[PDB]
Design a protein around this ligand. Structure first.
Ligand SMILES: [Mg+2]
Ligand SMILES: [Mg+2]
Ligand SMILES: [Mg+2]
Ligand SMILES: [Mg+2]
Ligand SMILES: [Mg+2]
Ligand SMILES: [Mg+2]
Ligand SMILES: [Mg+2]
Ligand SMILES: [Mg+2]
Ligand SMILES: [Mg+2]
Ligand SMILES: [Mg+2]
Lengths: 251, 251, 251, 251
């Protein structure tokens, strides 16, 4: 029955070709937003767009690299051709190398910062004024539970996700006058294709034990919160961080 | 267009006869939940129930005092007669006397703790097992931005609202195994009947200036978040505190 | 070598007859504060005062019950007879019954709220103006890591400790103009006499595993932070919550 | 009277030639740590070292650029020649351009991230194992109140300071086994040489009004907390963020 007040506008979803991004794109499009699915992986972005269109929705794909500042602008222009851009979801991300801080490779550190932080910033530089010019709207940045707590051996990821909370607060303060809301979502561990394809059973049980609900989350359980926060029903929600974590951070 | 996945169940809304509670009740009932509106003020609870019924929804009123532990049980029993209780919103609250900590009257301190904290606890003692017995669901506790920051001269209120975050975390951890989610919502300052009836213009401008959006929130902007968190779409959200504050706490 | 800038004044330490309170009292007195040790247990308060005096320090005991608002005033008067009261540490507390929220006995809930929250408030009502009248100073409220996260079956304790963060924020805002700083300390699990006397080995290993340092904290490791925050070196620290938790809340 | 348990070891203080860094260096050296003052400005680093030596302390200067990963290693080697490195304070930082997110120059964004975040990481890569090899110790990262709240037009700074909280949490979790504590300090606005030399009176009054104490902080009020957290008295404090903000974040 869930329906989101997101129609009459376009939405960018970065990393939209799989997992959480796919779920976000499907959920927004099923409630009437015209979705621009961007992803580095063209096959995946095209597949999600085909699912949306087959279900009666409106979407277009644009394959490219969010670490190129020009791609952020190309994404905004493409979305505006569908309908006025009023939602952007900065979701693309990478996990990085597993290594303690002292041993973390410099190129992996810089790569994780570049994708998980700087590409969000590049996206927002294109998105903020564009959404303001369309009467306001919402930017949802995909942080993590690791935007507020740590997790050994993934310091670059944790650091970048913490950084996003501040970028979110600042843009919220600066663009409130144009009615551009900016929020961050913090998922716990989610069962996506990487998890069910590569995670060993001992690892899974260990992670499940850290969530009070005793399971990993599902992509659709993140997408619902994103779609809500992107919608007109969330019109007084800005600057804030919203956990969807099964109780992970409550202990 | 917003619709919440809350049908096929009953919902208790305490303090449901006016303001935020009224909006919560209307929003839940418009998406199909059978709502038990409780309030100390019988006229107000009956009026909201009449609005719900006139709009095609299902509701019943129960007037009484949430500081009586027996009223929490009477509320659960009455809701279960409508449909299985799977949502409870502990929203009733009072502001207390305006006085600094050192001068706060003992009877006003105790009264604010009793209504804003202990009555939530009494409600949860009835609600948690009852919702567990109906296959799980959600309890939404109405904290405030004053559950995480202070506000001079309202220490009893601030203290009680901070307390609710811990009660929420603990019940979330303890009842996750029964799939009873427990969350807290933190509204900024909201334009309800008390605000538009008694607040002077200088006070209003001062409070508006503390929210990045430059206005107070509206009751429906709180109710939407509550209804979302109470719904099946929020199935991985538990233990957490969710601000609807116009940017108040982002600076 | 640690020395705290706390001389030329008196300090109240509630619950000062054992464990963390004892360590706080000893540390403050060793740096020259005149300490009023209060405790419900007269034997214990007298023993700590004797230790202080034997080590060359200045202290007096007052046995009584912090849940009596008059005892807060008697404590302030007794401290002022030693030297001007400029430090108060509200440390007395109880753990409560172990039971989930839904089963928590009403009398145990109310008792934990009364000691761990309301007695802190009663203390502050006496302390705030008195410290202001002596040129300012500091109140240190003893919260816990359970002021910011939960712990199953101890909801009354968690709730009261969360409440203290708000009471601390509010008094800090209200009494900053009189230069009365108010802060909260959040210890992780600490090895006190209750822990080494009654905690089973399996429980201990479980708790140790939740702290990154792999051990419980020691009372002197809490007392040092309290003494620092109570001192003139902490003159710009007010309103804030300071963890001494071995990394417990960083994951 | 304040004395810190920091002798018998060396300490790196980056950005140690002025302001907060100068105060940190002076305070650590006055309690017996052998301090390596690093700064991009050689004149300033030499001046602080001369002050330390004239007061009877032990210090050496090393001028260079913390954004060069090799300088982090040169700093560790130089400190170890004085005494075993067991304290590192990553304090160097820049404010960045004043501009909203959408207009922030790419080169200024990258520069602020490089100094305020990545150079802290480069420092920690040298410091963590070195301190572990000397029996453990402490790294204090200089965040801000802007590690937890925003401030319009300084998004790069806010973002980098938020990032530091996560880097701090992660290193704390990963190096706890070697007894290397890692913490973050969050000063409010502080009256340093930049403030008293360039800040206009209207700006000052505006900032003072945001702190409950009604004034900006002094460098020595930050240095005391840093020195405490760097000391053996802080042996159970790791992973955590400690505000010295005059009440700024308590509202
Ligand atoms: Mg294409
Ligand atoms: Mg190694
Ligand atoms: Mg945790
Ligand atoms: Mg009736
Ligand atoms: Mg008065
Ligand atoms: Mg604030
Ligand atoms: Mg006696
Ligand atoms: Mg039972
Ligand atoms: Mg030189
Ligand atoms: Mg412009």
């Amino acid at each position: 029955m869930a329906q989101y007040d997101v129609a009459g506008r376009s939405a960018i979803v970065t990393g939209g070709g799989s997992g959480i991004g796919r779920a976000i794109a499907l959920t927004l499009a099923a409630s009437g937003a015209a979705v621009l699915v961007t992803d580095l992986n063209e096959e995946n972005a095209n597949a999600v767009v085909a699912e949306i269109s087959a279900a009666g929705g409106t979407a277009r794909a644009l394959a490219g690299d969010v670490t190129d500042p020009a791609f952020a602008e190309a994404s905004v222009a493409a979305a505006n051709e569908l309908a006025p851009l009023r939602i952007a979801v900065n979701n693309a991300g990478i996990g990085g190398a597993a290594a303690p801080v002292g041993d973390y490779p410099l190129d992996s550190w810089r790569k994780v910062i570049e994708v998980n932080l700087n590409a969000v910033f590049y996206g927002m530089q294109a998105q903020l004024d564009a959404i303001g010019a369309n009467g306001g709207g919402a930017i949802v940045n995909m942080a993590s539970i690791l935007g507020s707590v740590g997790f050994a051996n993934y310091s670059a990821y944790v650091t970048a996700k913490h950084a996003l909370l501040g970028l979110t607060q600042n843009a919220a303060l600066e663009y409130a006058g144009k009615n551009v809301r900016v929020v961050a979502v913090g998922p716990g561990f989610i069962r996506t294709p990487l998890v069910a394809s590569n995670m060993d059973a001992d690892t899974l049980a260990f992670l499940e034990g850290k969530h009070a609900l005793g399971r990993l989350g599902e992509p659709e359980e993140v997408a619902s919160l994103v779609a809500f926060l992107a919608s007109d029903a969330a019109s007084f929600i800005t600057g804030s961080y919203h956990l969807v974590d099964g109780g992970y951070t409550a202990q």
